[PDB]
Symmetry: C2
Subunit: 125 residues, 2 copies
């Protein structure tokens, strides 16, 4: 049933992106996140995201859909072990996404718990 | 050129809705807002919105598009006077919107400035 928590956490990641409100990333991202093989602080990862969003220089009403970032039909959630879920989804290239160095068509996100209460994004690739 | 501020402010209203993060409504809504002929406090209007969103009991990945709330092709912005803009848009009925008493197909929003710096939503109908 933790599947619903992961979907909620992925949903919150997605909602933060589409709304360009990065304060919503603060309860989703682990204290250290593996970004393409390199650990980053939560705050340095979140600031990478806000800074790239600003480079897109998008029209205020552009990219206000989850369908602009992801193919939600492709979304897959799989328990990896007691404390780890793998989330896979096919992601889209847009004026915002091209500015994310870590952004790939075929995405892998690991959500991990260190307390069995909270599931945080601890790896993206 | 205040047209771009109104579009930004409407965009922020839209982003708060789609992301279901009502904290984003706090810099958009005037201290008193005329909701269908009756003045409401900002906090009572925002809490109406959060409470209705919770009644929809929507799937976490449902209604993550501006196209689920509004027809953005219909959006119109018009200066009414020195301190007032009328924003008109055709709005959609969904499991979330049916729980908003003030929600209408044909929407009128007034953005007003009391300082010439900040344009706030002061009426919705």
């Amino acid at each position: 049933n933790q599947d619903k928590i992961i979907k909620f956490q992925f949903g919150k990641f997605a909602r933060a992106l589409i709304s360009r409100n990065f304060d919503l990333f603060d309860s989703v991202i682990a204290d250290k996140v593996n970004v393409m093989g390199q650990f980053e602080s939560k705050n340095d990862f979140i600031s990478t995201l806000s800074s790239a969003s600003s480079k897109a220089d998008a029209d205020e009403l552009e990219y206000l859909s989850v369908d602009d970032y992801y193919d939600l039909k492709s979304l897959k959630i799989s328990k990896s072990n007691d404390t780890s879920f793998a989330v896979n989804v096919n992601a889209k290239k847009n004026d915002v996404t091209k500015n994310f160095p870590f952004w790939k068509e075929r995405q892998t996100m690991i959500f991990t718990t260190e307390d069995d209460n909270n599931w945080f994004l601890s790896s993206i690739n």
